[PDB]
Design a protein around this ligand. Structure first.
Ligand SMILES: COc1ccc(C)cc1NC(=O)CN
Length: 171
């Protein structure tokens, strides 16, 4: 059985208990914390690509009102985000299982942009998700995994200073 685990869940849970925020910019901003995944049970000799996307956790616009995040009352169906290909892709199962798979180079933006950067709906809440795609082989296969611990609201600047402080303390 293919096992997928979050590395540094301890730290993600500290962010999640405050409501996590990730900055989006026109040019794109890297994530802190970085999503790092522990993977076991791959065929060391099989070929895989690691994909990252962001699911809109709900259909609402969120606003920081008197020290607290609150959802709007006017939902709107959320279009799926684009997929980021881990730059080590494609690679042998052995490569992926030898150290945590680290999505350190994904950049989050608020503007339709050249290549790489993943565009998000601003002030929407997101749940990171990976797809492990077995490629090249006869039988194509996809395994998906969500990371609720890593949920965040996309922001153009931090709203909760407690988040600002944690981001600096642990970077
Ligand atoms: C600013 O709009 C967006 C940017 C990025 C993504 C993933 C979705 C949307 N909008 C929607 O999904 C609304 N149909």
């Amino acid at each position: 059985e293919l096992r997928v685990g979050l590395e540094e869940s301890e730290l993600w849970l500290r962010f999640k208990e405050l409501t996590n925020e990730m900055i989006v910019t026109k040019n794109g901003r890297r994530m802190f914390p970085v999503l790092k995944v522990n993977v076991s049970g791959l065929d060391p000799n099989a070929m895989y690509s690691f994909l990252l996307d962001f699911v809109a956790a709900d259909n609402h616009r969120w606003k920081y009102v008197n020290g607290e995040w609150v959802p709007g009352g006017k939902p709107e169906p959320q279009a799926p985000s684009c997929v980021y290909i881990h730059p080590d892709s494609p690679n042998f199962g052995a490569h992926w299982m030898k150290a945590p798979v680290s999505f350190s180079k994904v950049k989050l933006t608020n503007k339709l942009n050249g290549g790489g950067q993943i565009m998000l709906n601003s002030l929407h809440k997101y749940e990171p998700r990976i797809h492990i795609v077995r490629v090249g082989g006869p039988q194509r296969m996809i395994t998906s995994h969500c990371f609720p611990e890593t949920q965040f609201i996309a922001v153009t600047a931090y709203q909760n200073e407690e988040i600002t402080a944690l981001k600096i303390k642990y970077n």
